[PDB]
C-alpha cells in the first residue's frame, strides 16, 4: 500500500494520523523543515476569516472551500505541495483541527527529539533532547520561577494531606 516511516509522533491522535502522513512525507525528502516551519506560519495566518466562519463555515460550500484555500493554501506557498492534504483535510473538514496536526507534526520532528517535565516537581521548562532530567536540573537549579503551583510542589498535596491521612 506504501512502505513508509512514521517516526516519533506516532501516537495517532487522528491528527497524529495526519501528522504521520507528513511523518513520512515531510520526513522523507526532509521537507520536514520546510513544512515544520510552514505550519508555524499557517496556524495564525489561518484562524481568522481565512479559518473562521468565512471559511470553516460549512455554509461556504465545500468546493468553494477548496477554492478559497486553493485560494487560502494555494493562497500560500506555505504548502507548496503539502497543500494538498490541506485541500484535502479541507474537504475532509479537519480545518479547525489542524493545530493538533500541526502540533503533532511539529512536535513529531521537535517531539521527535525532545523531552518535557512530567514530574512530581514544578517544571514546564521543556527540552529538546532525548537525554535529559539531568541537564535540566541545572536550569531548575539555576532559575527560580513558574507557577510554583506549576508541577509538584509536593507540599499542599503530598505532605499536606498526610497528618490528616494518618488522622
Amino acid at each position: 500500500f506504501a512502505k513508509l516511516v512514521r517516526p516519533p509522533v506516532q501516537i495517532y491522535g487522528i491528527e497524529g494520523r495526519y501528522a504521520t502522513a507528513l511523518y513520512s512525507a515531510a520526513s522523507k525528502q526532509n521537507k520536514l523543515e520546510q513544512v515544520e516551519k510552514e505550519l508555524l506560519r499557517v496556524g495564525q495566518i489561518l484562524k481568522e476569516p481565512k479559518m473562521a466562519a468565512s471559511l470553516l463555515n460549512p455554509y461556504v460550500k465545500r468546493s468553494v472551500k477548496v477554492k478559497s484555500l486553493s485560494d487560502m493554501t494555494a493562497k500560500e506557498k506555505f504548502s507548496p505541495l503539502t497543500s494538498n492534504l490541506i485541500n484535502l483535510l479541507a474537504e475532509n473538514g479537519r480545518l479547525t483541527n489542524t493545530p493538533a496536526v500541526i502540533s503533532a507534526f511539529s512536535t513529531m520532528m521537535s517531539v521527535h527529539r525532545g523531552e518535557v517535565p512530567c514530574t512530581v516537581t514544578t517544571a514546564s521548562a521543556l527540552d529538546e533532547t532525548t537525554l535529559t532530567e539531568l541537564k535540566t536540573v541545572l536550569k531548575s537549579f539555576l532559575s527560580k520561577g513558574q507557577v510554583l503551583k506549576l508541577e509538584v510542589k509536593i507540599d499542599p498535596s503530598i505532605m499536606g494531606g498526610m497528618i490528616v491521612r494518618i488522622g
Binding site: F1, A2, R17, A21, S24, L85
Partner: protein, 509 residues
C-alpha cells in the same frame, strides 16, 4: 480523511498532491482485509455490484460501493489475502455458466462441477442477476407434478412452475422427501415430454460435502443424477458461494424454463443462506434485523423465488418450479423468514415428527400441508379419489377428536377411523418411492371405496405392495388406459375393482 482511511499511505501523498492512485476506478488496492471483508481502496468509479477479481485469485463482489472503498465479499480464502492487494474490476457482475451439462453433475455454484471429480464446463453463461418473470411471460400451472409419493401427489397434488415450501426438521429422510421425488422424476426424465423431463436442480445451500456425498451417493444409487444439477455450496463452501448458489441456480432453472424445458429447483435451504447472508451483512456491519436477519432477505427471496414460475409459450411454455425448502428447528416458522415465506408460497408442506416416530414415514401434516393453489394443478384421476379422501381423512382426524379414549361414536365412524387408518397405511412411503398416477389412484380407489377396512391396517401395507405389483403386472391394459387418461376411467374402476376385490381376496387370503 474520516473514519475510513486516514491511513498515512493514503493521507501520505494527499499531502503532496493527492498523488498515488492505482486506478481507483477499476482497480483498487486492498485497503484492509480481515474478516474476508475487503475494503478495497479505490475501485471507486466502479459499477454497482460488479463481481471483481482479487489478486488472491478469488472473486469477490464489490457489493458495497462505499464512498471510499468497496466492501468486497471474498469468494474464498484470506490468509491468502493481505492488504494493498490489487483487486481489479472484471468490469463485470456475475453470470455463471449455464448449460445442460450440469445435468449429470455436482457442482460448485461458480459453475465448476466439482465433486472431487472436478468440473465439466457448461459452456454457456448467464447472468445470475436475472429477474423474475411478468404476467405475460407467465402462464398457469395446470400441469400436475409428481413425486411418486402418494400423499404428495394426491393430497397436495403438485404442478410445475411452483414456489412451494417444503418444511420440516432434518432427516426424516428430510432429504428423502426430495429424493423420492427425484427418483420419481426419472420416469419423467425418461418421459417423453420435456416437462416430464424435468431438470432437477438441487441447490444444496450450506450442505456439507459429506452429507451431500451421501446424498449424491443416494442419487448415484438412483442415478437420477443424469438429469440433475446439484448446485452445491456445501457447509464449508464460502458464505457468498452458498449465498450465491440459489441465484445462480435460479438463473439456470429459468433458463430451461425459458427454453421451454421445465426445471425444478429445490432450494435446500434458504435457512442456511439467510444466516450466511446476514452474517455477510453483519460483517459488513450491515444489519441483522428481525431474527437477526436484515429484512431484504425477503427482497432477496421474494425476487429470487418469483423467478420460479410457469411460463407461457413465449418462454417455450416452460417452467422453473421452485420447491423451496426450509428445514425447521422445532417447526419454528414463527421464524421470520418462514413468516415471509408463508406470505410467499402458494402453499407449504408440513412434516410431523410425531408421526415419524410413530413410524409414519411420511409423517406429514397433510392437514397443514397445502397448496393454496391445489385444484389448478390437478389431475382428474386424483381428483376423483382424493377429494373425498381428503374429506375422509378430515373425518379420521375429526374423529380423532374422539379417537382418543373411545373411538366408536358408532360403528360407521369407528369405521371412518379404520378407513382413515387404512388410508394411512398408504401414506407411508418407505425410503425410495417413485409412483405413477395410476398406481396411486388404483391403490387409493380400493380404500376410498372401502375394501380395506375389513382388512386390517398392517396388511394394507402388505397388500399395497402386493396389489400394486399385481395389477401392474396384469392389467397394464387397464392401467395403461388410466395412465393414459391421466385420470380414472370408470370402466377401469370396475375392472380394476374386480381385479382388486379378487386380488384383494388373494392377498388377504
Amino acid at each position: 480523511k474520516t473514519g475510513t482511511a486516514e491511513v498515512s499511505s493514503i493521507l501520505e501523498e494527499r499531502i503532496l498532491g493527492a498523488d498515488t492512485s492505482v486506478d481507483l476506478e477499476e482497480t483498487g488496492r486492498v485497503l484492509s482485509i480481515g474478516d474476508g471483508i475487503a475494503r478495497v481502496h479505490g475501485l471507486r468509479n466502479v459499477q454497482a455490484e460488479e463481481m471483481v477479481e482479487f489478486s488472491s485469485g478469488l472473486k469477490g463482489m464489490s457489493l458495497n460501493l462505499e464512498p471510499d472503498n468497496v466492501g468486497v465479499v471474498v469468494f474464498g480464502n484470506d490468509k491468502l489475502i493481505k492488504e494493498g492487494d490489487i483487486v481489479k474490476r472484471t468490469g463485470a457482475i456475475v453470470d455463471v455458466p449455464v448449460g445442460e451439462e450440469l445435468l449429470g453433475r455436482v457442482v460448485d455454484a461458480l459453475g465448476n462441477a466439482i465433486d472431487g471429480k472436478g468440473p465439466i464446463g457448461s459452456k454457456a453463461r448467464r447472468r445470475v442477476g436475472l429477474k423474475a418473470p411478468g404476467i405475460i411471460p407467465r402462464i398457469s400451472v395446470r400441469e400436475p407434478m409428481q413425486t411418486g409419493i402418494k400423499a404428495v401427489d394426491s393430497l397436495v397434488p403438485i404442478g410445475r412452475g411452483q414456489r412451494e415450501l417444503i418444511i420440516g426438521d432434518r432427516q426424516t429422510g428430510k432429504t428423502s422427501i426430495a429424493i423420492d421425488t427425484i427418483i420419481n422424476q426419472k420416469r419423467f426424465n425418461d418421459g417423453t415430454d420435456e416437462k416430464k423431463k424435468l431438470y432437477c436442480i438441487y441447490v444444496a445451500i450450506g450442505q456439507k460435502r459429506s452429507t451431500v456425498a451421501q446424498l449424491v451417493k443416494r442419487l448415484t444409487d438412483a442415478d437420477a443424477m443424469k438429469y440433475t444439477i446439484v448446485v452445491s455450496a456445501t457447509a464449508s463452501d464460502a458464505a457468498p458461494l452458498q449465498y450465491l448458489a440459489p441465484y445462480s441456480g435460479c438463473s439456470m432453472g429459468e433458463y430451461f424454463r425459458d427454453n421451454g424445458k421445465h426445471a425444478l429447483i429445490i432450494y435446500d435451504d434458504l435457512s442456511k443462506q439467510a444466516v450466511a447472508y446476514r452474517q455477510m451483512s453483519l460483517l459488513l456491519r450491515r444489519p441483522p434485523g428481525r431474527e437477526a436477519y436484515p429484512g431484504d432477505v425477503f427482497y432477496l427471496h421474494s425476487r429470487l423465488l418469483e423467478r420460479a414460475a410457469k411460463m407461457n409459450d413465449a418462454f417455450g411454455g416452460g417452467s422453473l418450479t421452485a420447491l423451496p425448502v426450509i428445514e425447521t428447528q422445532a417447526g419454528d416458522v414463527s421464524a421470520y423468514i418462514p413468516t415471509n415465506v408463508i406470505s410467499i408460497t402458494d402453499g407449504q408442506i408440513f412434516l410431523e415428527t410425531e408421526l415419524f416416530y410413530k413410524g409414519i414415514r411420511p409423517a406429514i401434516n397433510v392437514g397443514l400441508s397445502v397448496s393454496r393453489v391445489g385444484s389448478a394443478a390437478q389431475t382428474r384421476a386424483m381428483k376423483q379419489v382424493a377429494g373425498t379422501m381428503k374429506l375422509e381423512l378430515a373425518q379420521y382426524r375429526e374423529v380423532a377428536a374422539f379417537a382418543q379414549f373411545g373411538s366408536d361414536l358408532d360403528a360407521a365412524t369407528q369405521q371412518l377411523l379404520s378407513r382413515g387408518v387404512r388410508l394411512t397405511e398408504l401414506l407411508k412411503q418407505g425410503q425410495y418411492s417413485p409412483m405413477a398416477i395410476e398406481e396411486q389412484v388404483a391403490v387409493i380407489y380400493a380404500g376410498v371405496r372401502g375394501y380395506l377396512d375389513k382388512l386390517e391396517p398392517s396388511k394394507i401395507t402388505k397388500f399395497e405392495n402386493a396389489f400394486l405389483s399385481h395389477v401392474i403386472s396384469q392389467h397394464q391394459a387397464l392401467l395403461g388406459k388410466i395412465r393414459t387418461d391421466g385420470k380414472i376411467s370408470e370402466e377401469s374402476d370396475a375392472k380394476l375393482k374386480e381385479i382388486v376385490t379378487n386380488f384383494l381376496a388373494g392377498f388377504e387370503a
